[PDB]
Each structure stands twice: as C-alpha cells, then as structure tokens.
C-alpha cells in the first residue's frame, strides 16, 4: 500500500476494506493482528490466541490503528502460518469491466 | 442480487459497493441511473444526459434508492449501450485467499 489510502470499512466483521490508487485490499482482521502480535512477541501460538477473531465488530479507531500498523510490518503479506493476510483486486479490473479508463 | 443485501458505500464517487451472501458488486452509478432512466423514458440519449455522472458524491438515501430500483430493472446487467452495469467478485474468492471456508 501507498501512504495515501482510504479505509472503506469492515465487511462481514472479518475483512477491512482499504484502497490506494492501485488496489482495493480486503485485509483479514485476525491474520493482520496475529502478524502484528507475532512480530512483537515472536510466539505464533500466543500471537494467535490474543488476536481479534473473525466475527468481532471493530471500531473505526481500532480499524485505523490496524491499517496504520499493517503498512509498517516487516511482513505485511502472510501471517506466521503462511496464509495471505489479504485479498487484492486491481482497481483497473473494476473500471475496465464497466468500460472506464483507469 | 438476493433480496437481503448490505450497502457498503461509494468508492471513488463512481461505484456503489453492495453485497449479498454470494457476491460483492461494484455498481457504476452513471450506468445504473442511465438504465433506470432508459427503461422509463425509452430514449438512450435523454437517459444518459440526465443521469448522475461519475465523480458526484451521492447521499446515503440516493444510494439506497438506486440499489432498490436496480433489483427491479428489466435489465440490471447492461446499460442501453451494452456496457456492464457492475463488476462482481464472488465472496468465496476473497475468503479462500486468506484460507477461510465460504
Ligand atoms: Mn508460546
Ligand atoms: Mn490464528
Ligand atoms: Mn491458532
Ligand atoms: Mn488513532
Ligand atoms: Mn496464522
Ligand atoms: Mn484486466
Ligand atoms: Mn432523444
Ligand atoms: Mn452514458
Ligand atoms: Mn452519452
Ligand atoms: Mn429511501
Ligand atoms: Mn450507456
Ligand atoms: Mn476460486
């Protein structure tokens, strides 16, 4: 993610939607917080058990915190178990489908 | 779209994001209103020129109206010029990427 981004909100109490000028990202809130905790604690079991789970509503402030920290992780791509932290769609795929330039 | 859906908001002042249990839809606000106006007026030039354009902010109420009407169109799929009204992503593609069942 570029430094300039827009948080669109939570989906299914599971993903944080955030976009920059290139992609829309669907960030798994559990995998992100597990990665945040794992880089601090260096213990994957502890990081997992203390992190938020899917199905929990998050406040706007909590969402802001997580996304800000995400950009500074050493590994913002995969959790300690190797699962992708996010799904991404290039914005151009959305624009081109409806016949718009991007 | 199924009758039960969740509007997630506007993106880039261009798309309305709305999901049901199967897909997340990115609905082009101009193409949707052009389709609404075209089915009423039966004039594609008039329908186009009176419809909202990309880049206009829409109120929550206006967004609700458009999405409610979208589901009742005779052709909710393509505008009178044949451009797809929306892009869609199966929710399972997002969930499966992060290792979740859906
Ligand atoms: Mn441990
Ligand atoms: Mn875990
Ligand atoms: Mn675990
Ligand atoms: Mn803050
Ligand atoms: Mn993990
Ligand atoms: Mn493409
Ligand atoms: Mn005319
Ligand atoms: Mn038009
Ligand atoms: Mn036109
Ligand atoms: Mn209303
Ligand atoms: Mn058209
Ligand atoms: Mn698939």
XYZ file of C-alpha atoms and ligand atoms in Angstrom:
216
model
C 0.000 0.000 0.000
C 0.882 3.566 -0.846
C 0.961 6.064 2.054
C -2.233 7.728 0.805
C -5.161 5.366 1.249
C -8.875 5.296 2.047
C -10.444 2.920 4.568
C -13.853 1.827 3.296
C -14.878 -0.126 6.421
C -15.461 -3.649 7.658
C -17.104 -6.459 5.658
C -18.736 -9.483 7.337
C -16.968 -8.458 10.582
C -13.998 -10.272 9.022
C -12.254 -8.041 6.460
C -11.111 -4.432 6.494
C -11.558 -2.852 3.075
C -8.893 -0.267 2.284
C -7.737 1.083 -1.085
C -4.962 3.149 -2.538
C -4.706 4.406 -6.121
C -3.851 0.915 -7.429
C -5.698 -1.793 -5.492
C -8.616 -2.458 -3.206
C -7.426 -4.657 -0.357
C -9.562 -6.989 1.798
C -7.479 -7.404 4.943
C -8.264 -10.331 7.264
C -8.531 -8.715 10.696
C -7.431 -11.853 12.564
C -4.433 -12.558 10.334
C -3.342 -8.906 10.481
C -3.476 -8.647 14.253
C -1.805 -12.063 14.533
C 1.019 -10.741 12.364
C 1.263 -7.543 14.455
C 1.419 -9.565 17.663
C 3.798 -12.127 16.170
C 6.349 -9.515 15.093
C 6.282 -8.085 18.628
C 6.099 -11.291 20.648
C 7.914 -13.781 18.357
C 5.486 -16.508 19.510
C 2.941 -17.668 16.943
C 0.687 -19.513 19.412
C 0.493 -16.537 21.760
C 0.046 -14.087 18.897
C -2.847 -16.147 17.545
C -4.707 -16.640 20.839
C -4.670 -12.966 21.875
C -5.681 -11.547 18.488
C -9.134 -10.490 17.391
C -11.195 -13.182 15.707
C -13.387 -13.073 12.649
C -16.925 -12.094 13.579
C -15.989 -9.310 16.007
C -17.135 -5.804 15.131
C -14.246 -3.323 15.232
C -14.438 0.377 15.977
C -13.310 2.946 13.428
C -10.360 3.849 15.657
C -9.290 0.196 16.030
C -9.525 -0.231 12.250
C -7.378 2.867 11.736
C -4.769 1.521 14.165
C -4.554 -1.867 12.474
C -4.226 -0.438 8.969
C -1.605 2.078 10.061
C 0.429 -0.699 11.692
C -0.046 -3.052 8.708
C 1.972 -0.729 6.439
C 4.956 -0.852 8.827
C 5.125 -4.612 9.348
C 8.249 -6.441 8.265
C 5.927 -8.954 6.565
C 2.577 -7.375 5.654
C 1.864 -10.239 3.224
C 1.491 -13.534 5.120
C 0.707 -14.492 8.698
C 3.201 -16.653 10.666
C 1.406 -19.761 9.336
C 1.861 -18.556 5.753
C -1.728 -17.606 4.935
C -2.118 -14.437 2.817
C -3.158 -11.578 5.093
C -5.273 -10.013 2.353
C -7.019 -10.418 -0.971
C -6.452 -7.655 -3.504
C -8.191 -6.606 -6.707
C -6.584 -4.138 -9.135
C -8.876 -1.142 -9.432
C -8.405 -1.244 -13.206
C -10.260 -4.586 -13.336
C -13.330 -2.899 -11.815
C -13.123 0.193 -14.015
C -12.436 -1.729 -17.220
C -15.425 -4.046 -16.717
C -17.804 -1.067 -16.865
C -15.942 0.474 -19.813
C -13.989 3.152 -17.920
C -10.332 4.115 -18.268
C -8.007 3.515 -15.331
C -28.797 -9.843 -6.174
C -30.707 -11.589 -3.433
C -33.359 -9.533 -1.592
C -31.185 -9.392 1.536
C -28.141 -7.235 0.879
C -25.772 -4.785 2.559
C -24.738 -1.464 1.022
C -21.097 -0.780 1.868
C -20.956 2.738 0.372
C -19.477 4.674 -2.516
C -15.970 4.186 -3.950
C -14.172 6.916 -5.936
C -17.541 8.724 -6.231
C -18.105 6.281 -9.105
C -19.181 2.866 -7.774
C -21.733 1.752 -5.210
C -20.474 -1.266 -3.288
C -23.259 -3.638 -2.276
C -23.094 -7.327 -1.342
C -25.391 -10.237 -0.768
C -24.416 -13.673 0.546
C -22.762 -14.623 -2.769
C -21.081 -11.622 -4.400
C -19.745 -8.156 -3.772
C -20.979 -5.878 -6.539
C -19.369 -2.616 -7.724
C -22.244 -0.801 -9.411
C -21.427 2.071 -11.791
C -23.672 4.899 -10.595
C -23.918 6.527 -14.036
C -24.697 3.303 -15.896
C -27.287 2.304 -13.280
C -29.157 5.593 -13.359
C -28.914 5.622 -17.165
C -30.547 2.194 -17.189
C -33.254 3.353 -14.743
C -33.989 6.400 -16.885
C -33.800 4.417 -20.123
C -36.374 1.847 -19.003
C -38.728 4.701 -18.078
C -38.075 7.075 -20.964
C -37.116 4.655 -23.786
C -34.615 7.253 -25.072
C -30.944 6.420 -24.580
C -29.630 9.928 -25.317
C -32.036 11.555 -22.873
C -31.458 8.873 -20.251
C -27.704 9.407 -20.488
C -27.718 13.219 -20.327
C -29.980 13.482 -17.263
C -28.247 10.786 -15.207
C -25.671 11.282 -12.494
C -22.067 11.243 -13.652
C -19.012 9.606 -12.185
C -17.330 11.911 -9.696
C -20.515 13.107 -7.980
C -20.892 12.299 -4.295
C -24.230 10.611 -3.569
C -26.194 10.726 -0.343
C -26.982 7.556 1.581
C -30.665 7.949 0.701
C -29.915 8.381 -3.024
C -27.691 5.289 -2.910
C -30.473 3.314 -1.227
C -32.945 4.417 -3.908
C -30.681 3.420 -6.783
C -29.879 -0.011 -5.363
C -33.521 -0.720 -4.572
C -34.507 0.203 -8.134
C -31.591 -1.764 -9.648
C -33.055 -5.068 -8.402
C -36.357 -4.382 -10.203
C -34.968 -3.379 -13.595
C -35.872 -5.480 -16.602
C -32.153 -5.439 -17.476
C -29.989 -4.918 -14.379
C -26.930 -6.208 -16.274
C -26.035 -3.837 -19.132
C -26.760 -0.207 -19.928
C -28.539 0.688 -23.214
C -25.108 0.902 -24.898
C -24.255 -2.619 -23.726
C -21.665 -1.800 -21.066
C -21.832 -3.983 -17.922
C -23.527 -2.002 -15.158
C -21.368 -3.644 -12.498
C -18.269 -5.635 -11.669
C -18.744 -8.560 -9.306
C -16.392 -10.694 -7.232
C -17.544 -13.967 -5.642
C -17.124 -13.650 -1.895
C -15.574 -17.124 -1.845
C -12.577 -15.804 -3.820
C -11.861 -13.326 -1.004
C -12.390 -15.848 1.789
C -10.422 -18.625 0.101
C -7.383 -16.395 -0.493
C -6.965 -15.905 3.268
C -7.613 -19.593 3.980
C -11.233 -19.321 5.159
C -14.201 -21.504 4.237
C -17.064 -19.951 2.292
Mn 4.013 -19.796 23.254
Mn -4.564 -17.722 14.020
Mn -4.125 -20.735 16.193
Mn -5.978 6.670 16.079
Mn -1.952 -17.556 11.038
Mn -7.886 -6.799 -16.931
Mn -33.820 11.741 -27.567
Mn -23.976 7.425 -20.667
Mn -23.946 9.607 -23.706
Mn -35.415 5.780 0.959
Mn -24.513 3.585 -21.510
Mn -11.520 -19.663 -6.548
